Design a binder for this molecule. Structure first.
Ligand SMILES: *[C@@H]1O[C@H](CO)[C@@H](O)[C@H](O)[C@H]1NC(C)=O
Ligand SMILES: *[C@@H]1O[C@H](CO)[C@@H](O)[C@H](O)[C@H]1NC(C)=O
Ligand SMILES: *[C@@H]1O[C@H](CO)[C@@H](O)[C@H](O)[C@H]1NC(C)=O
Lengths: 89, 125, 121, 107, 105
């Protein structure tokens, strides 16, 4: 469960609206804002004494999230496990 | 700021059931990552863990007392409730509530970052 | 790493025809749209045509519209330009490129080929 | 068709000098403008996209700005290696177009 | 409950560094935490995950966990630090607490 979310947009900067979809420990968050994204966006997590368990550390996807137009919250979207998605606009 | 407070009876007789209520503020009991536990401490003695409840309705109990312990929560009033049945005189102690830090990957408790004030309970005829 | 190689250039007469191609490698060619841009010696850049990643839609400059056709093959990772009814004014170095474009191409990168010289005389 | 123009047509400057190039669009293209650099015998290289977005690997002495119809390109401290012709491209609407270009020479 | 062993007390002068340790069977396999308590009051978390301070906790506090022994240290111990310190650790999600150590300053 390393892949957590996606960024969609055009310029992908603070000039225009962009769509950010991120899963966290208990929910899924969808936001649309004039985000100022990090040079290399990611989520920070740390691990327990045993490698089997982990906890939320910091959120490092963007430096700012101004002029938001949309927000939605629900439950997480997420042998080996195969997950498939289709994204349309 | 995150705060918790205990309330309930301060005196019960032997062979009676006690209910203690924890009131919380600064956070919602329905928020992910949230949990609350209960601990008791007899006069001059060390802390003894009783039980805890998580936001996902998962629960843990101390195996030495589990048979007499129940923990529930009110999702509307933001409260957590502990029940101890059939108390004996030896169960005289100060009872505490506290917030529980827990790991998300695999259910595993960590530490109590926020504690209440404690309420003294006497068991006596 | 990323390569774009134009070829098929040569010397032809007015009223004739010539077909150019551009080989692509080192990247997911079939994921990107492509542009043709030409430049005469001592002159600035002239945009020629654009084709979508799927080879669906095609766009042309008025200077070549009705005479030139843009096409592609995603199995051979090759971009093509079919030019008919050539004129002296078509003398230029023809480039294939993946132009960075936040609106149309969707590319986050910008690549240009070596260019191939076409002469009409 | 959106037409692009540039000013000056050419300029000369010494090492350490500040150099500016102005571009103008016949139509409002928002910030949808690319700045390209070209030297003789070579293909154009992109230095700036979306008006002011500096490309990775481009030296900090380069910058861009402007919006709507009026755009600018600046070199804060000209080097011997910065002698080249710069072009503006608009990509708001197809067909895309390039400007006439501005040449920077050595003083 | 998980077993934790502590000294009954430690004694230092003000301005000196105090150290309280706790031993067990599986401390090297689990994270330890420490709490400070005074009579008539609830305990406060001073150290968690072996060597981390909670916000609001004086910079004097530090700790470690090695050789199946947990440590709490107070650098430049003040008279305000004259309190009972407890060690906690978990084993298979079962809690354990030590007897507590009374620190005299
Ligand atoms: C955790 O990973 C480390 C390697 O980084 C390994 O040495 C250790 O044994 C692992 N522990 C468990 C419980 O998997
Ligand atoms: C975006 O937010 C700023 C304040 O942070 C405001 O001044 C500006 O007008 C807003 N832009 C739009 C289009 O609302
Ligand atoms: C996860 O996202 C939800 C929704 O925004 C938020 O309430 C919660 O605090 C976030 N963090 C955790 C640990 O759930």
């Amino acid at each position: 469960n390393i892949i957590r979310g996606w960024i969609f947009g055009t310029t992908l900067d603070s000039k225009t609206q962009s769509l950010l979809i991120v899963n966290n420990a208990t929910n899924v968050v969808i936001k649309v804002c004039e985000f100022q994204f990090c040079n290399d966006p990611f989520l920070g997590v740390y691990y327990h004494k045993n490698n089997k368990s982990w906890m939320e550390s910091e959120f490092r996807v963007y430096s700012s999230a101004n002029n938001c137009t949309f927000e939605y919250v629900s439950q997480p979207f997420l042998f080996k496990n195969l997950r498939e998605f289709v994204f349309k606009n | 700021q995150i705060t918790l407070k205990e309330s309930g009876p301060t005196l019960v007789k032997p062979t009676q059931t006690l209910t203690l209520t924890c009131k919380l503020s600064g956070f919602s009991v329905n928020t992910g990552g949230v949990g609350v536990g209960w601990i008791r401490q007899p006069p001059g003695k060390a802390l003894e863990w009783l039980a805890l409840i998580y936001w996902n309705d998962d629960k843990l109990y101390s195996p030495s007392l589990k048979s007499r312990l129940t923990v529930t929560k009110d999702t509307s009033k933001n409260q957590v409730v502990l029940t101890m049945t059939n108390m004996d005189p030896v169960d005289t102690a100060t009872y505490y509530c506290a917030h529980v830090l827990v790991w998300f990957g695999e259910v595993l408790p960590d530490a109590f970052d926020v504690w209440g004030q404690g309420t003294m309970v006497t068991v006596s005829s | 790493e990323v390569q774009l190689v134009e070829s098929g250039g040569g010397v032809v007469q007015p009223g004739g025809s010539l077909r150019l191609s551009c080989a692509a490698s080192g990247f997911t060619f079939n994921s990107y749209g492509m542009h043709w841009v030409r430049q005469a010696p001592g002159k600035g850049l002239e945009w020629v045509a654009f084709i979508r990643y799927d080879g669906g839609n095609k766009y042309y400059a008025d200077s070549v519209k009705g005479r030139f056709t843009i096409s592609r093959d995603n199995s051979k990772n090759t971009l093509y330009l079919q030019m008919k009814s050539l004129r002296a004014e078509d003398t230029a170095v023809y480039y294939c490129a993946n132009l960075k474009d936040s609106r149309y191409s969707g590319s986050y990168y910008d690549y240009w080929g070596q260019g191939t010289l076409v002469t009409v005389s | 068709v959106i037409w692009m123009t540039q000013s000056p047509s050419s300029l000369s400057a010494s090492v350490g000098d500040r150099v500016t190039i102005t571009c103008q669009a016949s139509q409002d293209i928002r910030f949808y403008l690319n700045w390209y650099q070209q030297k003789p015998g070579k293909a154009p290289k992109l230095l700036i996209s979306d008006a002011s977005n500096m490309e990775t690997g481009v030296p900090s002495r380069f910058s861009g700005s402007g919006s709507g119809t009026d755009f600018t390109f600046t070199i804060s401290s000209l080097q011997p290696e910065d002698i080249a012709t710069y072009y503006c491209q608009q990509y708001d609407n197809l067909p895309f177009t390039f400007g006439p270009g501005t040449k920077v020479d050595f003083k | 409950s998980y077993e934790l062993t502590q000294p009954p007390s430690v004694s230092v002068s003000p301005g000196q560094t105090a150290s309280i340790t706790c031993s067990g069977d599986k401390l090297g396999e689990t994270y330890a935490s420490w709490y400070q308590q005074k009579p008539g009051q609830s305990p406060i978390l001073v150290i968690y995950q072996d060597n981390k301070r909670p916000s609001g906790i004086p910079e004097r506090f530090s700790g470690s966990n090695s050789e199946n022994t947990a440590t709490l240290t107070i650098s430049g111990t003040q008279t305000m630090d004259e309190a009972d310190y407890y060690c906690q650790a978990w084993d298979k999600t079962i809690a354990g607490f030590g007897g507590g150590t009374k620190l005299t300053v």
